Structure formats: C-alpha cells, structure tokens
Amino acid sequence: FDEYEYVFFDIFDTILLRNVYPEYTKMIWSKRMSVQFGDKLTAEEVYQLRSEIEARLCIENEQSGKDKEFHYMQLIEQLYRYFITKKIISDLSIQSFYDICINIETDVEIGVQYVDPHWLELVKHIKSDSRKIKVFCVSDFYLPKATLYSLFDYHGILRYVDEIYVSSEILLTKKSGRLFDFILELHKIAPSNVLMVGDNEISDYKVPIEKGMKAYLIDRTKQFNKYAEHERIHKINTIVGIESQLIKMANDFRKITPFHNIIFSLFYFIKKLHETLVNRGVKDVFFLSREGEYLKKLFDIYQGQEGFRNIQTINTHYLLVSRKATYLPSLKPIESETFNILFRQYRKISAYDFLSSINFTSDAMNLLSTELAFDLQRVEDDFPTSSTFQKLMKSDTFRNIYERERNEQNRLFKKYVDQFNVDLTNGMHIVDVGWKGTIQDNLFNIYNGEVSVFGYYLGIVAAGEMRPGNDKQGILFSSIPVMSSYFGVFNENRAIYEVLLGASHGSAERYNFNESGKIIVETSKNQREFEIYKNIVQHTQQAMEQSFIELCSVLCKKSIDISKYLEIFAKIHAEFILNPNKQELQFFDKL
Ligand SMILES: [Cl-]
Ligand SMILES: [Mg+2]
Ligand SMILES: [Mg+2]
C-alpha cells in the first residue's frame, strides 16, 4: 500500500453501471416525455431536440470562458422555450415543467442502474478497519448534484461517500482538468494525497497524473461490450429482431395453459392504455368488476415493471358494478322510462326476469305477483306488449317501489363512489373489456350528465349511447368511427377474453349500508362460477402473469411506440384463433 488521505471515485461505469447503453436513458426519457405531453411531438422529435440543445450548450459554454458542459437546468430552460412557443404546454410554468422533466429522468436512471458489487466491498474496506480515509466522487455529468445524491441514497451507498462533485454545478470538467483544480484548491488537498479511480483513461488517469495525484484505471471492456451489442439492437425508433423475438417467445408459451398467448394482446392493451391515461392527464382510473380484476392486476404490475415511481404513476381502484346493479338507479321516472336498453336485446323474458333486471327485491316480486294475480315465473314471447307488463306499469304498488328503489340506489351508489377519494370534477375514468360499454352508459346517466365519463375498452364493437360527456375508446380494436387496423383478428372468437378474465368473487347485486352507514356491495354467490375460477381460471391467470413479466423485461424501459408493431401482435393472435390446436377448443366449451 501507499498512504492516501482521499480516494476520488468516478461515478458512471465505475460505481454505477447501467442495464442499457448510457445514451438510451435520454431516449427513454424522450419517449416518456412524448407520452407526457399529448403526443404533440414524437419520441424521436423530442430526442432530436435534446441533442440539438445539448451540443449547443457545450459549444456555447466552451466559448464563454467555461468548459464544454451543460447544467440540467440549462437544457430544461431551452426545452421550455420550444414547448411554450410551439404551444405544446399550457398552464405550465417553468418550475413545474422542470419537476416533470427531472422526475422522468430520475425514474429512468433508477430503472436501469446498478452499483458495482466489487466497488461495494472496496468502499466498505475503505470506510472500515481504523485509519480514516475520506471518499469523494468526481464525475463529468449534466445532472445536478442533488440528483446524484438521490441516486446514491436510493442505492444505499451514500453512507460510504463524503462528497459528490459533478461537472454540472460549476461547469468545470475532469477532461479539462479544471474541475480537479477546483476540488484540490477549495479543500486544500495536497495532490499526492489523492488516489483517483475511474474507467476513462483521459479524465480518470492521464489528467489526474498530470495534476499530481495517484490514479488507478480500472478496465471496463466487458461492460462497454454489453453497451455495444445493446446499442446494436435498441435505437430511438426500432428494436432489431423484435418480430422474431416475440414470435419465438410466442412458440414456447403455447403449452403452458390453453390459450396462453392472448397475454401478448393484453400487454399491448396495458401498454397502450397507460399511454392514453397519462396523455389524457388521468391520475385515477377504475377497473370494473368482474373482468377488470385481472386487468387491474396486470396494470399494477406493468407500472412496477416500467419503473414508474414518482411521475406518470396512476392510482387504480376496483369498482364493484354489474349490469343489474347499475341499471335501476340510472332510469328515468316511470313517467318517461321505456326500458328500451333492456328491450333491445331481451324480449322473451318473464316478470321474474324483468323485475330482477330493474333490480327489485323478492318481497316486491312476491307482492306484485300476489297483488296483480300473475305468475312471476311465466315467460312471455313479447314482454313489452304483454298483459303482465301493462299491469305493472299501471299498478301503484309497482309505481311506489319503483320511485323508492330508483332514488335510493342512486343515492347509495353515489356515496359508495365517494369512498374512493376521486375527484370527478376532471372526469370519471373507467376501463373494462366491454364490447359495448353498457355499464358506462348507466354510470353517465346516474350522474344526470353532470359528470364527464371516459371509457377505455380492450375492444369496442358497439357505440351504445356515446355522446358528449360519454366517451368510449377501443385500445386494442374499435369500430368507432371506422374499423381499426386488424379489427377482424381480435374480434374473432373474442369470447375467450371473458373466459380467461374471470374474477374471484360473485357478481355485484345491490347497494346498502352496513352497521355504521358505510356502503357495502352485496354480491351473489354462484357456486359454479366460484369453482370455475378456483380450479381453472385462477391457475391460468397466474401462469399468464409470469409470461407477462417476461414480455415486460423485453418491452418495458424502451423508447419504442408500441403501436408500430400491432401487426406482430395481430400475427401472434391469429396463430391460435385461425388455427387453435386440438384440446384448446374443448377447453373453450367447458366454460
Ligand atoms: Cl466521467
Ligand atoms: Mg465514468
Ligand atoms: Mg436493475
């Protein structure tokens, strides 16, 4: 050994290593900023704008008596110029625009960074035994010192470091050597009492040796080869071999569970849905029972696999709703209600069917049938023109129970929603499989049009009562206004989505309070639907969760627009709908 008072460590590719090549973090930040601001600019246009500004400040700071370097606030101030002149931002000051910027990049770095385990035992040795050595960090970088304080604290290594010196705070670099002149002068260090340790031969050895310090150059040929082949594959707008990679990933999953490969469609839905919610500025989203239980499960996972930590993170809830629970409170007063939504698909029904669809109780059913001398069980060929329907509409007992239970369920459901701590002032944002968005039409009526409702569906084949304030969206496929690209692929045999997206509980029936006044949603326990999930759907739901993670490690933390490869997902989907092999068909009939 010699005898050093200070050990100076380079940061990047010395202490912190990246899963991606270092330039890819500005591309990922570019894609996430393009989603952040309304897709006004593409992921590549914001990235080109960052390049043009970064190399601009380098040349400008160079010939201002400073060194070739830029502070992060200088980049953000210029970005605020282009954004506000091109009308990309609105109601956004410079300070809040900086917050979104620095939080995307801080989460981006956190997602791909990892500390060198060799550096950990090393810095532990330095910070232990007995003789007291101080540990500094000198890095040529653009992020503020407070940002690298955050990263080191998050990695749990800031306890071994005593100072952090970044070229962005004083705009002096290790390359020019002036940053060394500043640290040695301020701290009053004798050069020969410093051991510099880094990966660059110029900035971490040649210049330190010239300044009088002892230096050690560690080898990174194995780490920079990993960056070399990763840059071969991941560019700003493409990933080479992504088609064969997905298709190969789709050949080995097929025997896991029957119809295991719709998980690729669900990943496209989850990834494009998230872009749409963040683009719309959505902070709260509701997943509808019961098909939405597994959809929320995958959406909560996805945000965790993308590294969303402090920005572009969405709170998700679970709204216990069913067609039956949401239709009654949405109706008009009996003087105007025609029940057309119920009569457009069901006509050959019984009074028991009708009184259950408008969600009457068995006591009301056992009183109306008993009072009006009709059979509750008897099914009619045309109920809207039936005698029993004409009897009910005229009966005052019906007319009493109708107004009482329509206004109560409306009051009880609305206070059930208030328990979720969501401000419907900006809008109620809902996600489901759908096809039609029936429940959404009910929800919008329940609030009497005072609440803007936004629907986001896996697929949409029927518009229903779409109108201003009642908006619907088909993420994977839609027929509004026109059929979207590859409509026939995902619409064909679309029943498998309802099968594989079963929930663990019963269907939502009605709303009432518990003991204290808090609203409890009663569910109908259908024993055979419970057995289907427990013994079949639940197992395949968790087997697809694992293949969903592997799709995440290949498609999360990238700069790609997922919509550019919908054809690849349409390809994979068709290979088991246009040719579903052997027993997969018999599994479909069982449930
Ligand atoms: Cl450096
Ligand atoms: Mg370095
Ligand atoms: Mg990692």
XYZ file of C-alpha atoms and ligand atoms in Angstrom:
594
model
C 0.000 0.000 0.000
C 0.911 3.670 -0.218
C -0.768 6.186 2.104
C -3.701 8.164 0.691
C -5.796 10.749 2.521
C -8.599 10.906 -0.074
C -9.859 8.392 -2.627
C -11.639 10.026 -5.570
C -14.110 7.819 -7.442
C -15.587 8.329 -10.875
C -19.337 7.722 -10.897
C -20.641 6.286 -14.157
C -19.153 2.962 -15.340
C -17.066 2.982 -12.132
C -19.582 2.966 -9.251
C -22.898 2.837 -11.138
C -23.429 0.559 -14.142
C -26.416 0.585 -16.497
C -28.567 -2.165 -17.996
C -28.781 -0.100 -21.205
C -26.155 1.915 -23.022
C -25.835 5.374 -21.427
C -27.358 7.276 -24.361
C -30.519 5.131 -24.224
C -31.605 6.854 -20.999
C -32.137 10.109 -22.914
C -34.137 8.128 -25.484
C -36.315 6.515 -22.804
C -36.750 9.951 -21.241
C -37.693 11.166 -24.726
C -40.386 8.525 -25.236
C -41.798 9.183 -21.767
C -41.821 12.943 -22.374
C -43.639 12.410 -25.692
C -46.344 10.485 -23.836
C -46.285 13.086 -21.058
C -47.224 15.951 -23.374
C -50.110 14.860 -25.567
C -48.052 13.146 -28.294
C -47.624 16.605 -29.826
C -44.056 15.582 -30.650
C -42.945 12.023 -31.294
C -40.442 10.174 -29.122
C -37.788 10.831 -31.770
C -38.572 14.531 -32.236
C -38.066 15.285 -28.535
C -34.844 13.258 -28.629
C -33.513 15.234 -31.600
C -34.489 18.417 -29.757
C -32.424 17.301 -26.771
C -29.372 16.551 -28.938
C -29.573 19.929 -30.687
C -29.680 21.699 -27.312
C -27.040 19.626 -25.504
C -24.395 20.046 -28.212
C -25.489 23.696 -28.403
C -24.727 24.428 -24.747
C -21.433 22.512 -24.962
C -20.178 24.778 -27.752
C -21.690 27.865 -26.089
C -20.292 27.222 -22.604
C -16.984 26.347 -24.290
C -16.574 29.827 -25.814
C -17.908 31.693 -22.766
C -14.724 31.067 -20.780
C -16.205 27.883 -19.301
C -15.769 24.241 -20.335
C -17.700 22.017 -22.732
C -20.524 21.111 -20.346
C -24.135 21.944 -19.557
C -26.242 22.042 -16.413
C -29.573 20.229 -16.499
C -31.482 23.463 -15.823
C -29.968 24.950 -18.989
C -31.396 22.054 -21.010
C -34.792 22.422 -19.328
C -34.934 26.192 -19.850
C -34.380 25.705 -23.587
C -36.954 22.896 -23.690
C -39.410 25.276 -22.022
C -38.729 27.715 -24.875
C -39.577 25.295 -27.697
C -42.556 23.829 -25.830
C -44.271 27.107 -24.960
C -43.701 28.715 -28.378
C -44.923 25.643 -30.278
C -47.908 25.664 -27.866
C -47.033 22.198 -26.572
C -47.564 23.174 -22.912
C -50.417 25.168 -21.384
C -50.988 26.279 -17.766
C -47.445 25.052 -17.058
C -44.881 27.409 -15.538
C -41.161 26.755 -15.892
C -40.827 25.405 -12.345
C -43.468 22.694 -12.767
C -42.127 21.882 -16.243
C -38.759 21.206 -14.608
C -40.348 18.942 -11.980
C -41.872 16.632 -14.594
C -38.590 16.643 -16.534
C -36.264 15.751 -13.659
C -38.660 13.130 -12.253
C -38.961 11.185 -15.515
C -35.175 11.056 -15.883
C -34.583 10.189 -12.222
C -37.019 7.279 -12.501
C -35.485 6.335 -15.859
C -31.989 6.097 -14.380
C -33.239 4.215 -11.311
C -34.789 1.586 -13.571
C -31.558 0.682 -15.377
C -28.774 1.480 -12.884
C -26.977 -0.932 -10.580
C -23.980 -0.483 -8.290
C -20.772 -2.448 -8.921
C -20.641 -5.149 -6.216
C -16.846 -5.036 -6.466
C -16.987 -1.350 -5.530
C -19.148 -2.176 -2.508
C -16.682 -4.440 -0.690
C -13.968 -1.964 -1.703
C -15.620 1.168 -0.305
C -16.636 -0.842 2.766
C -12.972 -1.727 3.340
C -12.048 1.956 2.966
C -14.800 3.005 5.391
C -13.799 0.382 7.990
C -10.811 -1.026 9.893
C -9.426 2.018 11.727
C -7.437 4.546 9.675
C -9.833 7.241 8.458
C -9.893 7.817 4.687
C -12.386 10.187 3.081
C -14.207 9.168 -0.099
C -15.071 11.754 -2.762
C -16.878 11.331 -6.080
C -15.838 13.306 -9.164
C -17.914 12.863 -12.314
C -18.361 14.679 -15.614
C -22.137 14.739 -15.954
C -25.095 17.037 -16.591
C -27.440 16.112 -13.746
C -27.484 18.336 -10.642
C -25.552 17.320 -7.542
C -28.855 16.842 -5.701
C -29.920 14.298 -8.330
C -26.801 12.172 -7.818
C -27.315 12.494 -4.066
C -30.750 10.948 -4.647
C -29.429 8.083 -6.775
C -26.668 7.212 -4.300
C -29.102 7.380 -1.378
C -31.584 5.175 -3.246
C -28.863 2.595 -3.957
C -27.855 2.639 -0.280
C -24.250 3.726 -0.867
C -24.365 7.421 0.072
C -23.427 6.289 3.608
C -19.940 5.440 2.277
C -19.435 8.733 0.407
C -18.434 12.079 1.907
C -18.636 14.483 -1.065
C -20.181 14.492 -4.549
C -18.609 16.742 -7.207
C -20.424 16.889 -10.558
C -19.243 18.837 -13.599
C -22.736 20.362 -13.940
C -22.747 22.560 -10.823
C -19.695 24.692 -11.697
C -19.360 23.712 -15.396
C -15.772 22.527 -14.937
C -14.847 19.048 -16.140
C -12.362 16.298 -15.376
C -11.479 16.250 -19.084
C -10.290 19.861 -18.973
C -8.737 19.165 -15.564
C -10.201 22.413 -14.212
C -12.658 20.504 -12.015
C -9.672 18.911 -10.275
C -8.075 22.337 -9.786
C -11.266 23.414 -8.016
C -11.532 20.465 -5.617
C -7.860 20.480 -4.588
C -7.869 24.250 -4.017
C -11.106 24.531 -2.015
C -10.488 21.523 0.243
C -6.771 22.459 0.452
C -5.624 18.983 -0.603
C -2.063 18.050 -1.455
C -2.255 16.301 -4.862
C -0.037 13.360 -3.862
C -2.513 12.511 -1.061
C -5.270 11.601 -3.553
C -5.970 8.300 -5.301
C -8.251 8.760 -8.314
C -10.119 5.669 -9.518
C -12.073 5.609 -12.768
C -12.765 3.935 -16.111
C -11.721 6.682 -18.585
C -8.006 6.850 -19.313
C -8.011 10.590 -20.103
C -10.285 12.011 -17.402
C -9.605 9.375 -14.711
C -5.868 8.777 -15.253
C -3.921 10.999 -17.654
C -5.264 14.295 -16.280
C -5.094 13.154 -12.612
C -1.482 12.025 -13.072
C -0.649 15.402 -14.625
C -2.302 17.211 -11.698
C -0.010 15.303 -9.309
C -2.442 12.698 -7.971
C -2.031 8.950 -7.872
C -4.543 7.298 -10.198
C -5.866 3.822 -10.948
C -7.505 2.941 -14.270
C -9.944 0.033 -13.964
C -10.885 -1.954 -17.065
C -14.416 -1.786 -18.477
C -14.001 -3.674 -21.765
C -16.588 -6.217 -20.610
C -19.080 -3.509 -19.625
C -18.625 -1.495 -22.831
C -19.122 -4.598 -24.975
C -22.520 -5.045 -23.316
C -23.320 -1.446 -24.261
C -22.091 -2.193 -27.791
C -24.475 -5.065 -28.556
C -27.322 -3.322 -26.705
C -26.895 -0.268 -28.943
C -26.935 -2.635 -31.926
C -30.494 -3.602 -31.001
C -32.189 -0.638 -29.269
C -32.397 2.576 -31.287
C -34.690 5.579 -30.856
C -37.470 4.232 -33.087
C -36.825 0.483 -33.512
C -35.619 -2.715 -31.870
C -33.971 -5.039 -34.376
C -35.164 -8.629 -34.194
C -38.284 -7.702 -32.213
C -40.537 -9.666 -34.581
C -38.624 -12.944 -34.342
C -38.157 -12.377 -30.601
C -41.887 -12.083 -29.891
C -42.782 -14.895 -32.305
C -40.177 -17.128 -30.650
C -41.496 -16.066 -27.239
C -44.963 -16.999 -28.532
C -43.975 -20.532 -29.593
C -42.801 -21.676 -26.148
C -45.708 -20.297 -24.093
C -48.354 -22.224 -26.024
C -48.353 -25.413 -23.934
C -48.427 -23.577 -20.573
C -52.202 -23.079 -20.395
C -54.956 -23.328 -23.008
C -54.950 -20.019 -24.903
C -51.851 -18.795 -23.101
C -50.882 -16.467 -25.965
C -53.606 -13.853 -25.544
C -51.254 -12.414 -22.916
C -49.476 -10.682 -25.808
C -52.740 -8.916 -26.673
C -53.173 -7.951 -23.022
C -49.654 -6.497 -22.900
C -50.471 -4.329 -25.916
C -53.700 -3.265 -24.205
C -51.966 -2.435 -20.915
C -49.089 -0.535 -22.554
C -51.255 1.498 -24.937
C -53.889 2.104 -22.248
C -51.240 3.564 -19.930
C -50.001 5.947 -22.626
C -53.595 7.067 -23.173
C -54.344 7.695 -19.493
C -51.107 9.628 -18.930
C -51.679 11.515 -22.188
C -55.167 12.491 -21.011
C -53.660 13.575 -17.680
C -55.511 10.857 -15.756
C -54.483 10.336 -12.124
C -57.296 7.948 -11.092
C -58.798 5.036 -13.026
C -61.453 2.490 -12.040
C -61.393 -1.173 -13.074
C -64.883 -2.657 -13.346
C -65.846 -5.972 -11.822
C -65.552 -8.639 -12.691
C -63.468 -8.959 -15.842
C -61.432 -5.952 -14.703
C -59.941 -7.657 -11.655
C -57.288 -9.410 -13.737
C -56.915 -6.292 -15.900
C -56.022 -4.183 -12.858
C -53.643 -6.904 -11.657
C -51.703 -6.624 -14.917
C -51.871 -2.817 -14.907
C -50.445 -2.572 -11.379
C -47.660 -4.992 -12.351
C -46.845 -3.058 -15.529
C -46.291 0.252 -13.730
C -43.927 -1.558 -11.373
C -42.042 -3.195 -14.243
C -41.590 0.142 -16.045
C -40.028 1.828 -13.007
C -42.780 4.414 -12.556
C -42.050 5.737 -9.077
C -42.720 9.481 -8.725
C -44.148 10.552 -12.112
C -46.527 9.077 -14.685
C -47.889 6.832 -11.918
C -51.636 6.204 -11.742
C -53.744 5.139 -8.774
C -56.054 2.238 -9.624
C -59.226 1.134 -7.844
C -61.772 -1.680 -8.159
C -65.380 -0.621 -8.767
C -67.888 -3.326 -7.813
C -70.504 -2.842 -10.542
C -72.690 -5.095 -12.674
C -75.341 -4.548 -15.332
C -78.057 -5.305 -12.772
C -76.587 -3.128 -10.010
C -76.160 -0.078 -12.273
C -79.279 -0.114 -14.475
C -82.037 0.573 -11.908
C -80.542 3.775 -10.388
C -79.879 5.186 -13.880
C -83.506 5.028 -15.041
C -85.861 7.947 -15.616
C -89.000 8.481 -13.543
C -91.625 5.921 -14.532
C -93.492 8.647 -16.444
C -90.691 8.701 -19.048
C -88.916 5.331 -18.706
C -89.445 2.948 -21.631
C -86.786 0.371 -20.593
C -85.524 0.333 -24.197
C -81.949 -0.565 -23.189
C -83.433 -3.712 -21.655
C -85.856 -4.373 -24.538
C -83.289 -4.039 -27.359
C -81.635 -7.386 -26.597
C -84.099 -9.251 -24.353
C -87.745 -9.692 -25.378
C -88.693 -13.301 -24.500
C -88.492 -12.823 -20.731
C -90.557 -13.406 -17.602
C -91.739 -10.999 -14.929
C -89.103 -12.506 -12.632
C -86.530 -11.636 -15.297
C -87.903 -8.115 -15.732
C -88.201 -7.358 -12.010
C -84.661 -8.659 -11.436
C -83.158 -6.627 -14.286
C -84.551 -3.420 -12.759
C -83.320 -4.951 -9.507
C -86.457 -5.382 -7.418
C -86.433 -7.461 -4.242
C -88.089 -10.849 -3.793
C -90.550 -9.232 -1.379
C -91.584 -6.707 -4.025
C -91.759 -9.575 -6.519
C -93.782 -11.675 -4.048
C -96.146 -8.719 -3.549
C -96.621 -7.504 -7.133
C -97.320 -11.011 -8.434
C -99.540 -11.657 -5.413
C -101.385 -8.343 -5.809
C -101.821 -8.409 -9.602
C -102.738 -12.117 -9.963
C -99.969 -13.038 -12.397
C -97.292 -15.730 -12.451
C -93.835 -14.322 -11.741
C -92.282 -17.444 -13.282
C -94.133 -17.429 -16.620
C -92.012 -16.276 -19.574
C -93.688 -14.220 -22.311
C -92.961 -14.115 -26.039
C -93.132 -10.287 -26.243
C -92.920 -8.826 -22.733
C -93.108 -5.097 -23.692
C -96.547 -5.798 -25.204
C -97.523 -8.306 -22.510
C -100.529 -8.024 -20.231
C -98.265 -8.526 -17.210
C -96.028 -5.632 -18.263
C -99.098 -3.460 -18.841
C -100.408 -4.465 -15.406
C -97.143 -3.488 -13.702
C -96.795 -0.086 -15.392
C -100.314 0.828 -14.236
C -100.040 -0.675 -10.743
C -99.488 1.845 -7.965
C -97.588 -0.661 -5.801
C -95.040 -1.043 -8.605
C -95.114 2.727 -9.148
C -94.305 3.169 -5.445
C -91.479 0.618 -5.176
C -90.066 1.879 -8.483
C -89.572 5.503 -7.427
C -88.372 4.481 -3.960
C -85.713 1.993 -5.099
C -84.552 4.038 -8.103
C -83.746 7.100 -5.991
C -82.255 5.073 -3.130
C -79.867 3.038 -5.289
C -78.850 6.284 -6.990
C -78.114 7.840 -3.594
C -76.471 4.678 -2.257
C -74.238 4.154 -5.297
C -73.051 7.771 -5.352
C -71.959 7.611 -1.714
C -70.315 4.272 -2.495
C -68.175 6.112 -5.058
C -67.334 8.931 -2.621
C -65.446 6.345 -0.533
C -62.773 6.134 -3.266
C -61.338 9.670 -2.829
C -61.523 10.511 -6.551
C -62.458 13.969 -7.845
C -64.935 13.504 -10.698
C -64.533 17.220 -11.481
C -61.858 16.377 -14.055
C -63.764 13.235 -15.057
C -64.583 9.635 -14.177
C -62.148 7.321 -15.978
C -63.189 3.685 -16.392
C -61.655 0.592 -18.000
C -63.256 -2.729 -18.962
C -63.352 -5.337 -21.712
C -66.778 -4.102 -22.744
C -67.608 -4.626 -26.432
C -70.372 -2.077 -25.825
C -69.705 -0.154 -22.609
C -73.190 -0.863 -21.218
C -72.315 -0.082 -17.594
C -70.678 3.191 -18.665
C -73.954 4.339 -20.225
C -75.633 3.569 -16.903
C -72.944 5.381 -14.901
C -73.212 8.525 -17.032
C -76.990 8.623 -16.600
C -76.678 8.033 -12.847
C -74.904 11.391 -12.506
C -77.513 13.051 -14.785
C -74.803 14.219 -17.181
C -73.064 16.353 -14.529
C -70.035 14.011 -14.567
C -67.859 13.523 -17.640
C -67.255 9.787 -18.080
C -64.360 8.409 -20.143
C -64.363 4.763 -21.216
C -61.271 2.783 -22.212
C -62.034 -0.705 -23.510
C -59.947 -3.593 -24.781
C -62.316 -3.710 -27.739
C -65.353 -1.758 -28.886
C -67.839 -3.133 -31.409
C -70.942 -1.078 -30.499
C -71.124 2.612 -29.636
C -74.224 2.389 -27.452
C -75.272 5.764 -26.071
C -71.990 7.503 -26.903
C -72.418 11.287 -26.859
C -70.701 14.412 -25.435
C -69.627 13.624 -21.891
C -69.974 9.862 -22.541
C -66.726 8.984 -24.325
C -65.569 5.475 -25.247
C -62.215 4.224 -26.513
C -61.120 0.943 -28.074
C -57.481 0.360 -27.192
C -56.832 -2.957 -28.941
C -59.587 -2.696 -31.566
C -62.561 -0.433 -32.234
C -65.270 0.216 -34.833
C -65.766 3.888 -33.900
C -65.869 5.593 -36.300
C -64.173 3.138 -38.646
C -62.758 -0.320 -38.063
C -59.221 -0.059 -36.730
C -56.208 -1.879 -38.161
C -56.622 -5.664 -37.707
C -60.210 -5.463 -36.440
C -61.110 -8.945 -37.668
C -58.186 -10.546 -35.842
C -59.011 -9.570 -32.264
C -62.794 -9.514 -32.769
C -62.827 -13.133 -33.962
C -63.572 -15.538 -31.093
C -63.494 -12.612 -28.650
C -65.332 -14.770 -26.088
C -62.022 -16.169 -24.804
C -61.348 -12.807 -23.118
C -64.434 -13.164 -20.911
C -63.447 -16.748 -20.063
C -59.832 -16.094 -19.054
C -60.695 -12.841 -17.227
C -62.964 -14.332 -14.585
C -62.836 -12.877 -11.091
C -62.529 -14.444 -7.651
C -65.846 -13.157 -6.243
C -69.531 -13.141 -7.126
C -71.414 -10.622 -9.229
C -72.447 -7.264 -7.802
C -76.141 -7.165 -6.883
C -77.203 -4.050 -4.979
C -76.055 -1.315 -2.600
C -76.878 -0.765 1.073
C -75.150 0.272 4.275
C -73.573 -1.957 6.899
C -73.848 -1.247 10.628
C -72.119 2.156 10.637
C -73.539 3.634 7.410
C -70.595 2.751 5.171
C -71.902 1.277 1.924
C -71.441 -2.459 1.353
C -71.984 -4.018 -2.076
C -73.868 -7.302 -1.861
C -72.664 -9.959 -4.296
C -74.495 -13.075 -5.466
C -72.501 -16.224 -4.682
C -72.915 -18.507 -7.702
C -71.210 -21.710 -6.595
C -70.358 -22.983 -10.081
C -68.749 -19.703 -11.171
C -66.662 -19.933 -7.992
C -65.496 -23.456 -8.862
C -64.521 -22.429 -12.409
C -62.154 -19.759 -11.104
C -60.689 -21.671 -8.156
C -59.794 -24.785 -10.166
C -59.173 -23.397 -13.671
C -59.174 -19.649 -14.300
C -57.086 -18.714 -11.257
C -54.269 -21.107 -12.187
C -54.072 -19.894 -15.797
C -54.345 -16.298 -14.568
C -51.097 -16.664 -12.602
C -49.345 -18.682 -15.313
C -50.042 -15.829 -17.728
C -48.811 -13.372 -15.099
C -45.361 -14.946 -15.428
C -45.239 -14.723 -19.224
C -46.458 -11.140 -18.775
C -43.339 -10.354 -16.729
C -41.086 -11.748 -19.461
C -42.871 -9.571 -22.012
C -42.144 -6.673 -19.639
C -38.387 -7.298 -19.456
C -38.325 -7.188 -23.271
C -40.702 -4.243 -23.906
C -40.602 -2.082 -20.752
C -37.978 0.647 -20.283
C -37.687 1.322 -24.016
C -38.198 4.233 -26.408
C -40.494 2.434 -28.865
C -44.057 3.332 -29.808
C -45.886 0.055 -29.176
C -48.448 0.846 -31.888
C -45.728 0.483 -34.548
C -45.816 -3.308 -34.021
C -49.544 -4.051 -33.659
C -49.111 -6.193 -36.778
C -46.792 -8.514 -34.844
C -49.392 -8.905 -32.099
C -52.081 -9.446 -34.736
C -49.816 -12.138 -36.205
C -49.402 -13.943 -32.879
C -53.101 -13.671 -32.032
C -54.151 -15.180 -35.368
C -51.868 -18.210 -34.984
C -54.175 -19.558 -32.243
C -57.551 -18.203 -33.425
C -57.239 -19.108 -37.121
C -55.674 -22.438 -36.105
C -56.457 -23.299 -32.447
C -54.924 -26.728 -31.941
C -56.555 -29.868 -30.519
C -57.975 -29.647 -26.983
C -57.898 -25.829 -26.783
C -61.327 -25.990 -28.440
C -62.731 -28.367 -25.810
C -61.454 -26.105 -23.020
C -63.496 -23.270 -24.544
C -66.790 -25.176 -24.393
C -66.279 -26.198 -20.753
C -66.689 -22.561 -19.697
Cl -16.651 10.822 -16.312
Mg -17.249 7.245 -15.962
Mg -31.689 -3.275 -12.477
